[PDB]
Amino acid sequence: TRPTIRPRNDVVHKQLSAFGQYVAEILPKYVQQVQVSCFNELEIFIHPDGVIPVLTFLRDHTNAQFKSLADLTAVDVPTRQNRFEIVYNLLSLRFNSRIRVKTYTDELTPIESSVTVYKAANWYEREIWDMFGVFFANHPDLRRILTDYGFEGHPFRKDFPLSGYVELRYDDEVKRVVAEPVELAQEFRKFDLNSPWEAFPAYRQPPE
Amino acid sequence: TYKFVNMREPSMDMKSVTDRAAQTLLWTELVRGLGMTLSYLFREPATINYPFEKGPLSPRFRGEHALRRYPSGEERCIACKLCEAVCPAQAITIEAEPRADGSRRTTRYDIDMTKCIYCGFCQEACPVDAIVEGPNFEFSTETHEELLYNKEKLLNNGDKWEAEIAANIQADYLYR
Amino acid sequence: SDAPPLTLEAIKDRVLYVLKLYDKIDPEKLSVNSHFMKDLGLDSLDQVEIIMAMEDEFGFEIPDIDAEKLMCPQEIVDYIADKKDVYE
Amino acid sequence: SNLTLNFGPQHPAAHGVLRLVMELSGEMVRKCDPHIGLLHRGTEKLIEYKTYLQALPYFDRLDYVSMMCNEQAYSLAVEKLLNIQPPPRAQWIRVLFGEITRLLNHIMAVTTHALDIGAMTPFFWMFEEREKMFEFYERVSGARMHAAYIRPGGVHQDLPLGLLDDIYEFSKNFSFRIDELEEMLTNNRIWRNRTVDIGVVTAEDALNYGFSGVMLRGSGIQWDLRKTQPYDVYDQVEFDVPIGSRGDCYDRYLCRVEEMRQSLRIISQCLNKMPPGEIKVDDAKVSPPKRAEMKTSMESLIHHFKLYTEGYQVPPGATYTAIEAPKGEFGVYLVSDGSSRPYRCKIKAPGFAHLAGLDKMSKGHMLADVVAIIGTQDIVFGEVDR
Amino acid sequence: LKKTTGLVGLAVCETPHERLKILYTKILDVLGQIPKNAAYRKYTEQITNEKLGMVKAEPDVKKLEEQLQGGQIEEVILQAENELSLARKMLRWKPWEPLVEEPPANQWKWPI
Amino acid sequence: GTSVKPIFSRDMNEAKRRVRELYRAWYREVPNTVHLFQLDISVKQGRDKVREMFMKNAHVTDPRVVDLLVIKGKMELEETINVWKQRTHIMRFFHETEAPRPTDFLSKFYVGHDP
Ligand SMILES: CCCCCCCCCCCC(=O)SCCNC(=O)CCNC(=O)[C@H](O)C(C)(C)COP(=O)(O)O
Ligand code: SF4
Ligand code: SF4
């Protein structure tokens, strides 16, 4: 385990574990889980109701000072009763550290908007609403950001097809661009790539 | 370790103040800019006389695709479909069957050059140096259809450019 | 001077004129007491359109909670008379 | 009632795909509402149908002014998920070409900003240097901009013989081109009138609005990911971080020029310290074997076949990996489900937040000031829309 | 005495010691209304008392900045204001209480 | 119990009231849309189309789904009023270039395999 293998950092791992325990102790009402990955990244899994109290804490506490919101995105996992995983990535410049805050929601449950905590969240939340259909309560101006005007559906959902449902062309009879059901001269060729042999024994699940 | 870019102070002696006033009233920095443009006017321009002169390119340059042959004239391609599998744009379509003499050869080899991103992954993946990106880059067309290359087009490209393709491969293959 | 002292008869007549311009209401089987849903067969959306036309005719807005109760021309007449402070 | 105007997409200062709905009172800008998505191509969904190698070229086309930097960010994310290490010479080549890329990007940003403002000449002087830099790209990879040179595990190919000397020859002359650009712009009173105290942003607002890079450092914030969170061999090169004092367009332009000079310094150090050795990780389950090995040994052929058909499996997990790209912090949130294709790939682009801050930055300004502020944010819409 | 903080929008504070004493005293006063066993109260009181004693122990501004590890005493004042606002919000939120709900059985299971 | 968090409305009555507000807004807006976009349809055609779009979702019985539908309709109306939509987007509601697709069994049998 020399040149080829990525080196470990026990010091950062211990520091992040201690700070995760700290955060979990301070906010037991909302914190459901804390994890430190082996490449030294701290994750805090919280109940949705705590989106605002937790973020605010992480922004304003003297020992956290996570002033920067690097990114805010969603992940779609259709097998879960709560479909959508909401991910906040925060950066503290005072302590030169990063943290990740995770929560969940389904298609019909709003998530509190965090524009009062981080203004940067505004567009990010719009993008989530555009791509996943997650509604953010008390957003100042929530509307589509990335898709075409009048576009139907949320493309980043796993069950949304890659080529969508409609395509566009110019029609001369009506003298304008029109939308029609999509037809492909060549269909996208689905590839089955997964090897039938297990790759990583350290991640084997119980056989139920 | 850092530096400040705009944290200087002007000296308030009468000499510096009068110099600033002379700059304000007589436009010295504008004359400096005019002098810079005048200096550039008398420099030799960097324009090349295209198409009589061309820009330099490397042996590694990725151009129009071609299908290659062995020195006996046999096709190098044996229809393994690694290029089709690796292609990030799904620009390659391959159909194959045993030939009349039993050889493993393609019946269809299409590259959609309007789908292609010219990444060169196909030629990296090819185990027999069959598909390559050649040096040609001047192959614009008047219709979309002419850019949907079939196997005959690619074999013609190989036959037409093999002299250059082989030299470029000889130049580069020790890095691969 | 300004507009004459509008009365209940004028209100009822203008309401009837507005209603008889609706394409989904039979012009001659409409009365002052007809019910939009039971007799005319109008849908809930149709009722909203009828109140919007009344707002256009009489020049003042009608809120949703008030507009929901108005289910016959007589209720509309009484609502308009009450808002405009008219007793005859 | 304010007048409503479509600024772009078909506008010279709108960068082709930006439609800005502007509410104006005379030429005073009452409100800015950027409408984007005119270059939204669904990259993040397309990546879910690719192997990691197949997904790599999509990053060239996000910030098409800084290609190898995007490649490096994605490669670092994948290498972190794979728990592998690139070889040292690959890391030195990565840093060298990242600084060449920063030179390219800062040339484009400064000269196009000057062209919006009205100074058209420096664009032509500096784009020949960009052309020479493009040749370095093409000589190393065969492509002028979309190199796909930097891959998880190292780089695709070693440098051709003679490339270092030519890079040195270019680098020993680029400083005079910088000097000529500064002679045209830095002390010019028209340029200062167009840039000083325009788009002033406070440090607190810059932090809260998600800004990064020069958009922070122009306001006095002492932050640079290469210094605070180094990657590859950035902790082995000496350079200074330019810091502004006013938070306006002029200080940001000064910062970018000084960043070009510091990039020259770093490039010199990289040229003098390039070590020998292999250029990709010596692990054939991740990096493909050499072509001679593939045609001689059975294991090499098997691993070539599998890496080019199925691709390497990545252990399950999620990482947020960020770098100091020329336009600010560029990040990837990469989620692996254990297979050979990424489950999710969210791309964080600095221009997204920077353009979201445009309406705040334009308060109290005119139309030309808004043109200058758009130029000073250094926006490319390939990364904004993805 | 200092000409500028170097940060746009952050003014130079005259009499930073008194401002810091006022802010730390206000923070402790607000924390006194939080339950004694709440971790937020004890942790914030510990760090606030450390900073308050350090402020009272060193009358030089530069040496106080060096000791506090807080980066330019004006930003220390800003951080104290942020902590006071957070303390009021936490008193309203009461996050010291038990978790509201347990997630579903496989909410966080990855992969799948 | 079902322990469900609302969006705007607690039951179906407030959701229906919000539906009526959105319908009134669209009905008022239609003539302005016809004038501003220079459409060749009548105001009656536009209102009939608006009614049709609303009627498409008449079967919904979940107040949260109704609230989200009203949110989407408000977004569409805001896009239309501010002329963020172009004429092509407005006319996309009418499908003027799509051939009429048969519905009876025999015509579908003749034309192809789709059920
Ligand atoms: C020019 C073209 C413009 C096109 C604009 C398109 C805008 C689309 C906006 C879509 C809005 C919605 O879906 S809103 C969702 C629709 N509402 C419901 O599904 C609730 C349950 N159904 C009912 O209440 C009845 O069927 C009802 C018919 C509503 C009347 O009810 P009443 O009888 O008790 O009054
Ligand atoms: S160059 Fe790339 S995109 Fe083009 S055919 Fe080869 S693999 Fe496909
Ligand atoms: S061109 Fe090469 S990679 Fe493609 S099918 Fe033929 S032999 Fe295989």
Side-chain angles (χ1 to χ4, degrees), chain A, chain B, chain C residues 1-43 45-81 86-88, chain D, chain E, chain F:
Chain A
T1 73
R2 200 162 296 93
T4 52
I5 309 186
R6 168 185 169 96
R8 296 242 312 264
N9 204 326
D10 292 330
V11 170
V12 177
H13 200 268
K14 281 206 226 293
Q15 289 167 353
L16 290 180
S17 309
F19 184 69
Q21 252 150 12
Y22 182 76
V23 175
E25 280 153 6
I26 291 183
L27 311 149
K29 188 180 180 181
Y30 305 115
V31 172
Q32 297 169 333
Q33 198 163 329
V34 185
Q35 280 176 188
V36 181
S37 72
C38 293
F39 39 90
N40 296 355
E41 286 185 19
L42 177 62
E43 298 187 290
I44 302 179
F45 310 73
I46 69 169
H47 190 269
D49 287 350
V51 169
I52 296 294
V54 164
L55 288 182
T56 310
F57 170 83
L58 289 171
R59 191 196 69 182
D60 271 357
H61 189 55
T62 315
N63 269 13
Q65 300 195 47
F66 285 91
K67 305 311 225 202
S68 179
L69 163 75
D71 194 67
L72 156 64
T73 197
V75 183
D76 179 22
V77 188
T79 199
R80 288 165 187 180
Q81 141 183 3
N82 296 302
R83 217 186 148 161
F84 304 110
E85 222 186 279
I86 314 294
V87 186
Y88 305 77
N89 274 294
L90 312 175
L91 163 73
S92 168
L93 285 80
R94 169 71 54 223
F95 303 112
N96 198 13
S97 295
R98 294 188 184 270
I99 199 163
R100 190 176 317 141
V101 179
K102 253 142 91 143
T103 196
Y104 50 87
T105 194
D106 70 350
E107 289 99 325
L108 302 178
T109 312
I111 294 280
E112 258 296 303
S113 177
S114 35
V115 287
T116 47
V117 185
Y118 301 103
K119 288 166 208 113
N122 193 299
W123 276 21
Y124 288 106
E125 278 160 4
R126 284 180 68 193
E127 175 164 345
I128 292 175
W129 155 260
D130 199 8
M131 304 330 275
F132 295 93
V134 171
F135 179 78
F136 285 91
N138 307 133
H139 195 279
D141 168 52
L142 196 74
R143 51 179 169 109
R144 81 179 69 252
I145 188 154
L146 287 183
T147 50
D148 189 15
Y149 308 106
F151 182 91
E152 307 227 292
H154 305 288
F156 279 9
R157 291 186 180 185
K158 289 280 168 179
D159 52 341
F160 197 87
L162 169 63
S163 309
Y165 295 101
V166 291
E167 60 185 10
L168 263 60
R169 69 176 181 90
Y170 180 78
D171 188 84
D172 191 86
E173 171 198 313
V174 292
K175 293 292 191 305
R176 69 166 176 268
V177 173
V178 299
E180 290 159 343
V182 61
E183 227 172 36
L184 290 155
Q186 189 171 32
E187 170 191 24
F188 180 88
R189 286 164 276 165
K190 177 156 68 68
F191 283 174
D192 285 343
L193 300 180
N194 290 285
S195 174
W197 287 92
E198 161 193 276
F200 311 113
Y203 298 83
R204 184 183 303 124
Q205 306 168 36
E208 285 314 309
Chain B
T1 289
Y2 71 106
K3 55 204 280 172
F4 292 118
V5 303
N6 209 23
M7 265 292 90
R8 273 193 151 166
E9 297 292 327
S11 57
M12 215 64 34
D13 56 307
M14 254 318 264
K15 209 277 184 162
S16 291
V17 165
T18 302
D19 282 28
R20 255 123 65 202
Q23 165 172 0
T24 295
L25 297 172
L26 305 176
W27 313 336
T28 62
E29 92 272 31
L30 307 170
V31 171
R32 263 184 104 150
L34 285 176
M36 182 63 75
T37 38
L38 182 72
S39 146
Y40 257 88
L41 182 88
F42 289 102
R43 298 173 202 205
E44 175 179 359
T47 316
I48 76 181
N49 193 34
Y50 183 82
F52 316 95
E53 307 166 343
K54 318 300 226 143
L57 298 174
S58 189
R60 301 182 187 181
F61 175 80
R62 320 198 285 259
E64 192 189 24
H65 295 70
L67 280 174
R68 292 186 67 227
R69 289 175 198 272
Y70 286 112
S72 66
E74 170 63 274
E75 290 158 47
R76 283 175 169 268
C77 181
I78 53 71
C80 74
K81 295 165 150 285
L82 301 204
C83 57
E84 192 181 33
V86 83
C87 180
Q90 294 211 337
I92 307 172
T93 316
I94 299 170
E95 291 193 46
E97 78 188 9
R99 218 164 50 189
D101 58 331
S103 178
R104 196 185 159 111
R105 303 291 165 189
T106 50
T107 56
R108 164 196 305 277
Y109 195 100
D110 299 330
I111 297 180
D112 193 334
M113 317 279 291
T114 66
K115 276 194 197 86
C116 180
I117 67 162
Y118 302 82
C119 61
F121 283 13
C122 44
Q123 73 177 351
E124 302 162 20
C126 189
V128 297
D129 307 19
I131 183 72
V132 300
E133 285 212 72
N136 187 42
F137 59 94
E138 295 153 326
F139 52 111
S140 291
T141 64
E142 307 203 353
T143 69
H144 191 158
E145 283 95 327
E146 296 160 78
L147 292 174
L148 270 50
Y149 286 4
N150 64 16
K151 194 194 172 175
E152 320 285 336
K153 172 71 180 166
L154 291 154
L155 278 174
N156 275 329
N157 280 343
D159 289 349
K160 154 179 184 189
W161 291 98
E162 177 58 31
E164 228 201 301
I165 282 163
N168 279 337
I169 289 171
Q170 172 68 33
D172 193 27
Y173 84 107
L174 285 177
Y175 298 97
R176 301 170 172 190
Chain C
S1 179
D2 36 358
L6 190 79
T7 50
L8 280 275
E9 283 325 307
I11 288 178
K12 200 252 276 192
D13 250 15
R14 277 201 281 151
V15 159
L16 279 179
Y17 206 90
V18 174
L19 280 156
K20 299 177 106 307
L21 286 164
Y22 200 41
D23 316 348
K24 313 165 140 204
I25 288 176
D26 262 358
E28 82 307 339
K29 281 141 29 205
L30 160 71
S31 66
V32 74
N33 268 103
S34 313
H35 201 269
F36 301 129
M37 321 261 156
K38 277 73 199 214
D39 323 297
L40 299 167
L42 298 188
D43 318 33
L45 292 177
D46 284 355
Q47 193 278 347
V48 175
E49 280 164 298
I50 291 175
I51 317 279
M52 269 186 302
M54 294 297 165
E55 295 172 20
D56 270 3
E57 162 59 52
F58 291 83
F60 76 104
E61 60 162 347
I62 300 187
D64 195 331
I65 200 43
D66 306 31
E68 281 299 296
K69 297 182 204 172
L70 326 184
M71 278 291 117
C72 80
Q74 183 58 45
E75 274 137 332
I76 304 175
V77 165
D78 285 272
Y79 180 82
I80 291 161
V86 187
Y87 66 98
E88 25 145 6
Chain D
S1 175
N2 299 319
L3 185 179
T4 306
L5 185 67
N6 280 315
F7 212 79
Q10 202 277 300
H11 194 105
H15 307 239
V17 290
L18 158 68
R19 171 199 201 179
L20 182 60
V21 180
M22 270 185 342
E23 270 145 50
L24 314 160
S25 200
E27 285 208 37
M28 284 309 270
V29 178
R30 287 296 188 254
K31 177 150 109 93
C32 279
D33 177 28
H35 286 235
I36 65 174
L38 296 177
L39 202 64
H40 172 70
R41 300 105 121 211
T43 306
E44 290 181 15
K45 202 194 180 60
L46 282 162
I47 280 163
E48 291 177 349
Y49 295 80
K50 316 286 169 184
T51 68
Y52 290 87
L53 177 58
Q54 279 185 321
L56 172 67
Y58 274 120
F59 283 80
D60 271 329
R61 288 136 177 100
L62 300 176
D63 175 10
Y64 36 84
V65 191
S66 325
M67 276 79 36
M68 296 216 201
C69 294
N70 311 323
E71 306 170 23
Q72 184 173 26
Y74 175 70
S75 308
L76 289 159
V78 180
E79 283 150 8
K80 190 177 316 173
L81 281 185
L82 285 168
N83 201 45
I84 60 132
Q85 177 166 48
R89 183 179 169 94
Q91 301 187 49
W92 277 105
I93 289 165
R94 278 168 175 207
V95 169
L96 167 68
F97 267 98
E99 288 315 313
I100 298 175
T101 308
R102 195 176 317 268
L103 277 194
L104 284 153
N105 173 97
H106 284 1
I107 283 173
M108 162 85 68
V110 172
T111 60
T112 53
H113 182 44
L115 197 147
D116 304 353
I117 271 69
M120 65 165 144
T121 299
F123 162 93
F124 293 94
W125 301 348
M126 284 321 231
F127 259 63
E128 176 58 26
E129 307 295 303
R130 275 184 50 86
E131 182 71 38
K132 276 174 284 188
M133 281 183 289
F134 265 27
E135 294 172 21
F136 293 144
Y137 259 56
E138 193 273 318
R139 269 159 82 183
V140 95
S141 73
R144 308 171 101 237
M145 40 197 270
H146 292 332
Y149 186 63
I150 300 176
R151 324 207 169 171
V155 294
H156 173 58
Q157 269 180 298
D158 203 352
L159 314 169
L161 287 167
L163 184 51
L164 291 176
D165 283 357
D166 289 18
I167 293 176
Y168 164 75
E169 287 294 330
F170 160 88
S171 311
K172 78 182 305 238
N173 291 338
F174 190 66
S175 187
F176 267 37
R177 319 275 84 79
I178 307 177
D179 286 328
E180 288 164 346
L181 162 86
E182 281 211 280
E183 197 71 70
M184 296 281 285
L185 288 177
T186 292
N187 288 322
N188 197 272
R189 73 183 80 184
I190 305 171
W191 175 254
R192 275 155 61 66
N193 277 330
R194 293 297 306 276
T195 44
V196 167
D197 279 332
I198 309 299
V200 171
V201 66
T202 70
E204 262 79 72
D205 271 354
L207 276 172
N208 203 242
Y209 268 89
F211 289 0
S212 53
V214 176
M215 305 300 307
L216 290 186
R217 293 189 285 273
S219 295
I221 297 175
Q222 297 176 17
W223 184 257
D224 197 297
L225 285 181
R226 281 169 302 164
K227 295 288 199 181
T228 65
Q229 302 173 18
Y231 42 96
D232 274 328
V233 290
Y234 267 118
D235 52 18
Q236 295 182 50
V237 288
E238 267 99 332
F239 63 106
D240 301 311
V241 172
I243 302 292
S245 299
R246 311 269 259 134
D248 61 352
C249 290
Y250 185 67
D251 277 22
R252 284 186 289 269
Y253 148 85
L254 287 178
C255 280
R256 286 191 178 93
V257 173
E258 190 51 48
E259 296 222 303
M260 275 189 291
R261 302 187 181 281
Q262 296 302 308
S263 269
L264 266 188
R265 192 174 163 191
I266 298 177
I267 283 165
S268 166
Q269 285 161 77
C270 280
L271 290 172
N272 283 306
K273 275 145 144 284
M274 182 81 45
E278 78 284 359
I279 65 90
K280 61 190 79 183
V281 65
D282 212 7
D283 182 2
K285 278 144 173 65
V286 172
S287 285
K290 286 168 172 203
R291 288 190 68 85
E293 288 152 3
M294 173 265 288
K295 287 181 206 202
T296 279
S297 58
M298 188 78 225
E299 287 90 336
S300 299
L301 185 61
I302 283 160
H303 286 64
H304 175 98
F305 189 103
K306 296 300 297 187
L307 282 177
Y308 278 106
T309 47
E310 172 180 3
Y312 45 80
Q313 297 89 8
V314 180
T319 183
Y320 175 78
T321 297
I323 61 142
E324 186 75 37
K327 286 171 156 84
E329 164 166 329
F330 179 76
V332 162
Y333 182 65
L334 192 59
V335 183
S336 166
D337 72 324
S339 69
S340 61
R341 297 182 269 213
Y343 187 87
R344 172 93 175 99
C345 189
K346 169 67 168 43
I347 302 163
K348 186 268 184 175
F352 192 74
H354 293 162
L355 185 65
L358 170 74
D359 186 46
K360 172 60 173 295
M361 278 174 75
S362 69
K363 274 310 163 53
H365 287 299
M366 269 177 222
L367 243 185
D369 302 325
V370 166
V371 163
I373 293 160
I374 295 172
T376 210
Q377 281 174 356
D378 191 21
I379 300 286
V380 66
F381 281 90
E383 72 160 13
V384 169
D385 288 1
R386 285 144 294 137
Chain E
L1 163 73
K2 156 173 50 188
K3 288 326 127 193
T4 169
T5 44
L7 293 165
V8 180
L10 189 58
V12 173
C13 180
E14 308 151 332
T15 86
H17 286 86
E18 227 48 27
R19 187 59 180 148
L20 280 180
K21 291 167 193 167
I22 291 166
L23 283 164
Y24 291 146
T25 284
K26 271 157 84 53
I27 285 156
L28 294 176
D29 293 10
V30 153
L31 292 177
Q33 311 167 51
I34 290 171
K36 179 109 220 294
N37 46 280
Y40 176 72
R41 169 178 178 159
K42 54 187 63 180
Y43 282 139
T44 312
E45 275 195 348
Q46 167 192 139
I47 66 200
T48 307
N49 281 312
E50 285 176 59
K51 284 179 205 297
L52 179 53
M54 273 171 99
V55 162
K56 294 148 121 34
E58 179 58 36
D60 195 84
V61 176
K62 248 87 182 152
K63 281 150 111 213
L64 181 57
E65 279 172 14
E66 196 50 341
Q67 266 177 315
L68 281 179
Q69 297 267 243
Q72 200 144 239
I73 206 79
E74 279 91 347
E75 321 171 53
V76 181
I77 293 166
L78 175 57
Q79 188 41 52
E81 277 143 38
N82 288 333
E83 186 69 66
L84 177 58
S85 173
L86 175 65
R88 299 199 166 110
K89 275 169 190 171
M90 293 279 284
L91 184 90
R92 184 175 118 272
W93 283 323
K94 307 170 159 54
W96 41 84
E97 296 166 349
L99 177 69
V100 283
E101 199 162 339
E102 295 280 8
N106 292 284
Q107 187 60 60
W108 296 123
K109 196 201 175 212
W110 190 255
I112 215 161
Chain F
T2 307
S3 158
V4 286
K5 193 144 82 62
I7 294 152
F8 289 111
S9 310
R10 312 206 55 81
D11 45 32
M12 272 321 246
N13 285 90
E14 333 192 76
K16 285 165 146 238
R17 194 223 73 210
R18 285 176 182 271
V19 168
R20 288 190 300 265
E21 268 86 77
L22 179 59
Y23 185 79
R24 274 148 92 123
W26 266 106
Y27 186 98
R28 293 304 201 181
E29 184 44 47
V30 162
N32 304 139
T33 303
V34 159
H35 266 208
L36 288 189
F37 285 79
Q38 282 170 38
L39 304 175
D40 307 322
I41 64 155
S42 63
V43 174
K44 197 223 209 273
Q45 271 177 269
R47 282 169 167 159
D48 287 351
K49 172 62 67 192
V50 160
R51 176 74 153 256
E52 192 212 310
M53 291 308 105
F54 265 82
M55 287 317 295
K56 174 174 334 312
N57 296 323
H59 58 88
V60 176
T61 66
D62 191 307
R64 292 171 304 165
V65 176
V66 176
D67 281 354
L68 278 177
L69 285 176
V70 166
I71 282 151
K72 298 190 163 210
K74 281 206 253 53
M75 273 170 208
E76 298 263 89
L77 184 59
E78 157 184 51
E79 268 178 27
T80 310
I81 287 186
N82 295 333
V83 201
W84 296 341
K85 284 184 190 292
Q86 306 298 103
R87 212 216 316 281
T88 176
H89 299 106
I90 292 296
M91 287 320 284
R92 267 165 222 195
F93 285 103
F94 294 86
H95 315 275
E96 297 191 332
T97 50
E98 293 179 39
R101 300 209 60 75
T103 291
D104 67 309
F105 179 93
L106 207 63
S107 303
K108 295 151 118 283
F109 169 81
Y110 289 148
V111 90
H113 310 100
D114 294 297

